Symmetry: C2
Subunit: 253 residues, 2 copies
């Protein structure tokens, strides 16, 4: 392909382990996630990647992942840019809830729909939600390209792509066309959103795409920035498929 | 009136070994990392809310900045790194033991090499043990100045000449815009900026030594000139002692 870029989902976190929808809650990576980030950097180093620019969300877990990757590459000097438009999909009222418990109470299929549907919008989070305050009172959301009151309170995967695409078009895509090697440290669903766009995945097929944590995703693009072949997870396919199954199994029981 | 924070990163392995590090990209050791976290805690106590962070391209200043932002929960704050904030280039003296130099050339000469404004260290030659790793690094192949035009040694005067343009053009404008800035730099690059901002004479700058891992508070007026001398944040006795420690590295037992 004419261009190559790397995107990935950050490493494991406390909630990623307790199996609770984290979303816009600024939870940190745990020891296991930090190591995943380090292994990503080692895999990228083994493949000679030399980044010119890194894009992250404003959730610290995606930022720390990038930092750990850069340290392993000895590329801490590479410019980093962060944007809420790369933030994980907003789970609204579901934030904080245990996936397996919801599966038990509502049915595996119901939870699977909420998690992977392109169109279903979660119930908006309310000021009465246990984590509303610790989200909308943070200064990082007072300096976004849109007023605090204009930020979403819940999003379907479709909503995510709608607020992420502008950033890709205006800030990231231009750099890729310039020949720069870009690294995107994002999240599970915000990453699924960008892949849908780049690979032209249908609304139906995007439902079956689940991304493993801490695994480099190589995308090869043509002159029009359209993927030339499905995304490629860099690493041992067997261990990567088990990690994907692990994510899927979070909604089973 | 405007206030900003600048500091020198924490200790590295060559600190206890008493060897000029300069442009060698040495990482912080355990102690240096802790020094950064302590700076972060102090800044958090003062409720600092940074808007921008400027660092050099030496990873120790970058890691220091990252640790401070983590302590503050401000990892999303924009960071910019430039070689123009790099520590003074010690030329051929890089890697040499400061006390050994004092025994070989005398304390007076060592003092001139370390703190004088106009004395230039002998240039580093291709045969020098640390030449390769420095000029072979990609971070210097993408600077605003060709790799072949980068200094091979610098007097404090040389440092100010390549650092001042960066301050005036990229940092000072943010200060005038009321932004809260953090400058994570080095011993002599910080001394060079202080000399300018405080209008310290070529002679008096020789007596200014900065301790590692200590927040430096500086207030500037409408003309971006120091309202008063810089101040060190923390236990003054421990600070003066740390300053003496640095001074004593250039003296005979």
């Amino acid at each position: 392909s004419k261009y190559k870029l790397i995107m990935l989902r950050h490493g494991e976190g406390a909630w990623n382990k307790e199996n609770r929808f984290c979303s816009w809650v600024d939870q940190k990576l745990n020891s296991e996630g930090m190591e995943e980030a380090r292994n990503c950097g080692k895999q990228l180093k083994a493949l000679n990647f030399e980044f010119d620019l890194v894009f992250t969300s404003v959730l610290n877990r995606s930022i720390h992942t990038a930092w750990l990757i850069l340290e392993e590459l000895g590329q801490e000097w590479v410019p980093v840019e962060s944007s809420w438009r790369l933030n994980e999909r907003h789970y609204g009222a579901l934030i904080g809830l245990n996936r397996e418990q919801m599966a038990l109470n509502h049915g595996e299929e119901q939870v699977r729909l909420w998690r992977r549907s392109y169109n279903v919008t979660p119930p908006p989070i309310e000021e009465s939600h246990p984590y509303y305050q610790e989200i909308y009172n943070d200064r990082r959301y007072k300096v976004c390209d849109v007023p605090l009151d204009q930020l979403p309170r819940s999003e379907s995967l479709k909503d995510v792509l709608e607020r992420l695409l502008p950033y890709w078009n205006e800030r990231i895509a231009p750099e890729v066309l310039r020949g720069k090697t870009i690294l995107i440290s994002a999240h599970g669903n915000s990453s699924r959103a960008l892949l849908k766009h780049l690979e032209g995945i249908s609304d139906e097929d995007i439902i079956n795409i689940t991304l493993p944590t801490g695994v480099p995703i190589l995308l090869e693009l043509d002159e029009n920035l359209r993927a030339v072949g499905p995304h490629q997870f860099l690493g041992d396919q067997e261990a990567i498929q088990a990690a994907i199954k692990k994510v899927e199994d979070q909604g089973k029981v």
